[PDB]
Design a protein around this ligand. Sequence first.
Ligand SMILES: [Zn+2]
Ligand SMILES: [Zn+2]
Length: 232
Amino acid sequence: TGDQRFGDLVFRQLAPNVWQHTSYLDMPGFGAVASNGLIVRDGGRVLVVDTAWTDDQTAQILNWIKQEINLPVALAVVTHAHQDKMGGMDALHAAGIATYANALSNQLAPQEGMVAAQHSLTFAANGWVEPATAPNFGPLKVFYPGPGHTSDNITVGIDGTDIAFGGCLIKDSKAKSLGNLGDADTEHYAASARAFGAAFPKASMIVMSHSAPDSRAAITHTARMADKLRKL
Ligand SMILES: [Zn+2]
Ligand SMILES: [Zn+2]
């Protein structure tokens, strides 16, 4: 398939300098739910998008990076204040890694049971990150598409590649539903999915948290699901 197992994690190379990390929730009354993030090698440093579900899983991502890449991890960006994306913040901080999240994610973190990132990203009215808040992000192009899966969800394009990461906002083109809607903005979801597509109009590989990588059909399918839900 392209997947490789390392401990209880799975890694899949997407480009010469990009890998998808996958971790699984291990809690007594739940099935083994996968969550995907990214690892980007930016020359002489590594950038991480999203933690795993737990600190121990996140430390295993760092161990894979040390073994397989062996460059320092300069920063991590987390895409919203849920456990699958921010559950391993303490492991990043223990490792001396600078962490960034939407200001709103950092505000929500205590209510959600998450540790806040060290740095807050803010956004222009067009959705693009304010550059002074995202210094030295290299190829990572951060975009806030509007409320959707959550009020705080952000997305990330990787310059020099065909890849854009929708996080938990985007589901694949065969998804039966929008997954976890507990915190979702049903009025704006479809427009936010569309805004993600329009922000990264050349991306051909759409990476998402809870499906395998897909084509741009994931974006349109997600927006349709959202529009149906809104019309009910
Ligand atoms: Zn979520
Ligand atoms: Zn999720």
